[PDB]
């Protein structure tokens, strides 16, 4: 009786995908577009998803560099998230999932026309739209880290770095919803306008106005929470800008990922003493350590998105040098775009019919 997509599997036999062929943080050096790869088949507990959008993530280049498990050698698949239609599935999976259903997921190997996804990690979505993909990593990271670690409450002051980017946009909005005063950093006046449209109380274009100075002058008593994703000298300023009982959440350090080690140097020598003297913290956050909170987060985010209560800005690359990010080949360009700092919102690549 049940359609498991077996006809599809017969006829949809080969596909394109991206493959890490050499470890490097230079994505173009590391990754090759492969063709006429077999379409993988789903196991009893799996879905086979035809990706229609895939997300571009800063750590894509950490992945390509082998930094998640240095002992794992090429070749391996890449891309952290996708959205599309179920084309086939295993028998067990069919209890809860159906051929043609719109699903989104966070699992490695999304940079492919088709990806096998365990049905246990799939998220049902209303339809295949790029706004929902924005939630999977970027939204959930901001949601869970702030909920679990931010201690947010009315009137607290929150500094968000890369605030106009994929995760930053949600850290901004979610802090505003908690009635915080929100400061955001970005690299252009048009990004600052975007931030202002999300409710940012103090956008800062760091290219034209020094962040440290603004913080010293406008926030002399400091900030309560920092959503820190840049690293380096920005991390150092953030530590100095903490209020008493302040918390710096280490979300990432993109300023370092292109470097050979992937790290951005910081002034750490006096950090324990600084933290003691302010009763302040530096707090790491890795989304994969918080998967017990993921399904709830995703559900709330999805409700806010569909209801119009959350801006989910998507950058499909229409304004990039070679235009809209269409096809797996465009992933190279999109990663470049990210590392040139040109995106507003979440970078997404379309894989259309």
Ligand X SMILES: NC(=O)c1ccc[n+]([C@@H]2O[C@H](COP(=O)([O-])OP(=O)(O)OC[C@H]3O[C@@H](n4cnc5c(N)ncnc54)[C@H](OP(=O)(O)O)[C@@H]3O)[C@@H](O)[C@H]2O)c1
Task: Please indicate if the annotation marks 51 as binding a ligand.
Answer: no
Q: Considering the complex, state which of residue 94 and residue 167 has its C-beta at the smaller distance from ligand X.
A: 167
Does the annotation place 287 within a ligand binding site? yes
Residues with Cβ < 8 Å from 133, sequence gap 6 or more? 53, 54, 55, 81, 82, 83, 104, 346, 348
134 is in an annotated binding site: no
Tokens read off for 36:
């006429």
Q: Tell whether residue 206 is among the known ligand binding residues.
A: yes
CA 181 from chain centre, in angstroms, equals 23
Which positions ≥6 away from 69 have C-beta within 8 Å?
Answer: none
Q: How far is the CB of 172 from ligand X (least distance, A)?
A: 11
Nearer to ligand X, 68 or 286 (CB): 286
Helix (H) or strand (E) holding 235: helix 233-240
**Local structure of 156: helix, strand or coil:** coil
- Helix H or strand E encompassing 216: helix 211-218
Name the DSSP class of 62.
H
Q: How far is the CB of 82 from ligand X (least distance, A)?
A: 15
Question: Minimum CB separation from ligand X for residue 251, in Å?
Answer: 5
332 carries a ligand binding annotation: no
Phi, psi of 110 (to 5 degrees): -70, -15
Nearer to ligand X, 4 or 18 (CB): 18
Binding region for ligand X (CB under 6 A): 57-59, 137-138, 141, 162, 164-168, 185-187, 191, 229-230, 251-255, 285-287, 338-339, 341, 343, 347
Minimum Å gap between C-beta 305 and ligand X is 17
* 179 is annotated as contributing to ligand binding: no
Buried b (16+ CB within 10 A) or exposed e, 314-337: bbbbeebeeeebeebebbebbbeb
Residue 147 counted as an annotated binding residue: no
Breaks (C-N over 2.5 A) in the chain follow: none
**Does 73 appear as a known binding residue?**
no
Residue 146 corresponds to which tokens in the numbers above?
A: 């702030």
Please, what sign has the CA dihedral across residues 114, 115, 119, 123?
Answer: negative
Q: What gap in Å lies between CA 8 and CA 6, rounded to an integer? A: 5
Considering the complex, what minimum distance in angstroms separates the CB of residue 170 from ligand X? 9
Closest approach of ligand X to the CB of residue 283, in Å: 11
User: Dihedral of the CA atoms 122, 149, 229, 189 (nearest 10)?
Assistant: 100
Name the token pair of 308. 């119009």
| Residue 47 or 133 with smaller CB distance to ligand X | 133
Beta carbon of residue 277, minimum distance to ligand X (angstroms, whole number): 27
Annotated binding site for NADP(+): 167, 187, 191, 206, 229, 251, 257, 285-287, 343
């Amino acid at each position: 009786g049940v359609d498991l997509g077996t006809e599809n599997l017969y006829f949809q036999s080969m596909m394109q995908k991206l493959v890490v062929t050499r470890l490097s943080p230079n994505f173009r050096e590391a990754v090759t577009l492969s063709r006429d790869c077999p379409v993988p088949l789903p196991g009893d507990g799996d879905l086979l998803v035809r990706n229609r959008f895939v997300g571009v993530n800063a750590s894509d280049i950490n992945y390509s560099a082998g930094r998640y498990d240095p002992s794992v050698k090429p070749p391996f698949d890449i891309g952290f998230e996708g959205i599309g239609e179920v084309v086939a599935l295993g028998l067990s999976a069919s209890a809860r999932y159906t051929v043609g259903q719109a699903v989104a997921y966070m699992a490695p190997g999304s940079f492919a026309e088709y990806t096998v996804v365990p049905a246990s990690i799939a998220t049902p979505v209303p339809s295949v739209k790029p706004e929902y993909l924005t939630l999977l990593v970027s939204g959930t990271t901001a949601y869970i880290s702030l909920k679990e670690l931010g201690g947010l409450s009315e009137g607290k002051k929150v500094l968000v770095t890369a605030a106009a980017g994929g995760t930053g946009q949600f850290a901004m909005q979610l802090s505003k919803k908690a009635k915080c005063h929100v400061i955001g950093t970005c690299s252009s006046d048009e990004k600052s306008a975007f931030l202002k449209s999300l409710g940012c109380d103090r956008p800062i274009n760091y290219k034209t106005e020094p962040v440290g100075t603004v913080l010293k002058q406008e926030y002399p008593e400091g900030v309560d929470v920092v959503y820190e994703s840049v690293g380096g000298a920005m991390f150092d300023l953030a530590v100095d800008a903490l209020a008493t009982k302040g918390r710096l959440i280490v979300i990432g350090f993109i300023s370092g990922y292109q470097t050979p080690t992937g790290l951005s140097p910081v002034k750490a020598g006096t950090l324990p003493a600084k933290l003691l003297k302010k009763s302040a913290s530096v707090q790491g956050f890795f989304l994969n350590h918080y998967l017990s909170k993921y399904q709830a987060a995703m559900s709330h985010l999805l409700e806010m998105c569909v209801s119009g209560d959350l801006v989910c800005e998507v950058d499909l690359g229409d304004l990039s040098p070679e235009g809209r990010f269409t096809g797996l080949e465009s992933i190279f360009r999109a990663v470049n775009y990210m590392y040139m700092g040109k995106n507003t919102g979440k970078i997404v690549v379309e894989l259309p019919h």
